Design a protein around this ligand. Sequence first.
Ligand SMILES: Cc1cc(CN(CCC2CCCCC2)C(=O)NC2CC2)no1
Ligand SMILES: Cc1cc(CN(CCC2CCCCC2)C(=O)NC2CC2)no1
Lengths: 297, 297
Amino acid sequence: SGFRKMAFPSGKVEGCMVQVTCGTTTLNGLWLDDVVYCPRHVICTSNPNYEDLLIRKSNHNFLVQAGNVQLRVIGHSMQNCVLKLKVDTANPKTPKYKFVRIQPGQTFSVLACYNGSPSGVYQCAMRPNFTIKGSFLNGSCGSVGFNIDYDCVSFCYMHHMELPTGVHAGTDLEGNFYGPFVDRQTAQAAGTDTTITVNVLAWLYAAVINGDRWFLNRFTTTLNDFNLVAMKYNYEPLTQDHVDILGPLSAQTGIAVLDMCASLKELLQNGMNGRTILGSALLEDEFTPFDVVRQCS
Amino acid sequence: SGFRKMAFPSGKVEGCMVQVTCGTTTLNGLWLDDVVYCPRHVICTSNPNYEDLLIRKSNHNFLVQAGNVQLRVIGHSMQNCVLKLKVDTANPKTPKYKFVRIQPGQTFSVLACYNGSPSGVYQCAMRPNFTIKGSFLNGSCGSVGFNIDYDCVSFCYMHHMELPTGVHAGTDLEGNFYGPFVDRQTAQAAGTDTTITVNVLAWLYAAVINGDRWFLNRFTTTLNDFNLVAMKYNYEPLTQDHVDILGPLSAQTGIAVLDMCASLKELLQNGMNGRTILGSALLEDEFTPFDVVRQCS
Ligand SMILES: Cc1cc(CN(CCC2CCCCC2)C(=O)NC2CC2)no1
Ligand SMILES: Cc1cc(CN(CCC2CCCCC2)C(=O)NC2CC2)no1
């Protein structure tokens, strides 16, 4: 029993983290085979044209360090908002990996790093507004996000920056931003966010599997009538695909999805009346159906 | 910015996890140098005298597997509630390590494992009643808890079992239980718990560092007057050592500890009035002062 925000074991990613320095800027890179991937921000100096900044660089300007071992840069290129530094040494710790872009509402593990040294690991969801609610300080740029499936690391996030509300923005490993953001100082701000309805329902199923039942009721609702309440409370609409994805959790608990939707309607309209669900006094939306199945009985 | 429940990177511990099987019981062991540490439960079969059960075993009865590599057991001994299996091979991935026992109110990272394969990583506090609120299923026995300081792994917890309230119990790596528990099925239950006051104050300092200030007030309280309110709300007493430990966070924020105690008194007496602190609608007590400093600006 028990239900925790649980990260993937980080070892396969730790073996890939390196330090990249250009002039007086140090940040993190990801060393896979003979390439180091890092944010192109590393080449900026006190609205940059990055194509011009990169043409002015030489391989020898990039100081790449894997622990105590300097990696010699033998080529450099720009891919969107990331740099590809070709090095003289293939990483012998390269795991099986893929570069995948994730959807809003999906979760991943963040390996927070500084100076190429991993600091901590935690779970993040990609918000509907394409930000993440992480924990990052100066020097964290180039920290990565990932999921692991059968020892294959699916890298989905490279950290770039903090927005003014204290939420975080970054790119896929192809260097394409999540969301309407750019890798420079502008007045850019997080768009309005919404609650990830399918994830709240997954977490209510986790709560039932773990013996929290107080919020259940004999009532069912329609999908249309549920979606009217969702809109009112700034919840995402629930689709039949969402209902289908919640199939296994519904089967395991014997609680129909639209019966659980009647519970969530009552929680939105009434609150909890001083009660808690899985240790929370709020409705939690950063667990996917897969996160619940991965972890729960 | 941001404040997350953050685990230590788990790689140094992943390289130590192995599978131990005796008869039809499989669980996890910890391989350091030429010894595998595991719960003595592995030798039980359908009130066991473990000294008798162990005298009846041979080295060849223990099947130890490190990934795909069988480790030959060349000696066995019992230390309290753990077994020490001497193997023919020193673990080449053994980190610098210590076996430390932790105090109630301290935190650690759990590497949840199954069949010797790491599954997930998350933070736990040792509760005042010597339980942890983890996430463990059958097969998790022998999963370990640890802190990392400058690449030295301080192992503090080996998982044994779930209690009837769905909280978890285990031992230090010397095999001594945390709390008044035993490694067999009895009617044993978690004792009454309390809230870790010094950790709630640390987390309110984290909240101020991260820009949540709504709960601050111009008032100060005495330590005695604070401790009268603490007792009423089932909070641990606050000691002058606690006030001293909160020194650095007080200095960083310019908020005196007894001024923050006046804020916590108001939160206990009045609640939050529908507001949140660091994304929580409850007072969080599973961050130590060190966890806040480790992570925050
Ligand atoms: C807080 C906080 C910091 C960070 C990451 N940053 C900021 C980098 C951005 C600055 C604005 C323009 C785009 C890149 C760094 O690690 N910066 C160090 C390497 C130089 N994230 O949250
Ligand atoms: C839920 C849950 C399970 C567990 C861990 N257990 C239970 C072991 C205890 C059983 C009672 C007596 C003392 C040992 C196991 O992993 N058991 C598998 C290896 C056989 N923790 O939470």
